[PDB]
Design a protein around this ligand. Structure first.
Ligand SMILES: [Mg+2]
Length: 219
């Protein structure tokens, strides 16, 4: 049986994309740029801060100095950190708390494999910290998803090989990173987005220990 589960944060445990979106929107409004809506935000998801800011500036064809660019970037991050102060256990995705309990009761290791720079803070606010055996530090890994490094680090941090692990992800890059790490992916979302070759569930309420066991046995 698998010995660990490696969790992405956004789109698996909770929604942080909402707060990034709101923070970019509020920045854009604050400097008179229109058009930062949820559709446009698709071009900002999982993209660096610089790239995002550049794309938002490119809407209005607005020019800034290096000093101004830096300050804008900081203001968005400050706004994001303010907005996540509201995170609570009410923000945990369905099925996830029960899954963590059940994994823990079965001595299966639980690790976070997220690019979130606020991962520990977020898990604390959601009261999940006690379930986690490690949180992979994205500052200590060389390359981001779809590189496998973050999943490798998460596995190793709990004393397992990625080949002994299931990885849970909602993104194409993340599924690819899981695959390349050696772990078994189980996607959440749509096969139209994540591929027909992996097991995918429609939402997180389908991530149960029994289902994960069945998937493991069938691989
Ligand atoms: Mg995700």
């Amino acid at each position: 049986m698998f010995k660990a589960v490696l969790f992405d944060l956004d789109g698996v445990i909770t929604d942080t994309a909402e707060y990034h979106f709101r923070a970019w929107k509020a920045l854009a409004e604050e400097i008179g740029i229109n058009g930062v809506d949820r559709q446009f935000n698709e071009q900002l998801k999982g993209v660096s801060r610089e790239d995002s800011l550049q794309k938002i500036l490119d809407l209005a064809d607005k020019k800034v100095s290096a000093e101004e660019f830096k300050e804008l970037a900081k203001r968005k991050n400050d706004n994001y950190v303010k907005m996540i102060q509201d995170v609570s256990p009410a923000d945990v995705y369905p099925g996830i708390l029960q899954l963590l309990k059940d994994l823990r009761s079965n001595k299966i290791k639980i690790a976070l494999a997220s690019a979130s720079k606020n991962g520990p803070f977020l898990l604390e606010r959601m009261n999940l910290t006690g379930y986690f055996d490690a949180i992979a530090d994205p500052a200590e890994v060389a390359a981001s998803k779809p590189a496998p490094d973050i999943f490798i680090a998460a596995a190793h941090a709990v004393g397992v090989a990625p080949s002994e692990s299931i990885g849970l992800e909602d993104s194409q890059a993340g599924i690819q990173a899981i695959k390349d790490s050696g772990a078994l992916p189980i996607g959440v979302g749509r096969p139209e987005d994540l591929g027909d070759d992996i097991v995918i569930v429609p939402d997180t309420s389908h991530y149960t220990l029994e289902f994960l066991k069945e998937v493991w046995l069938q691989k």
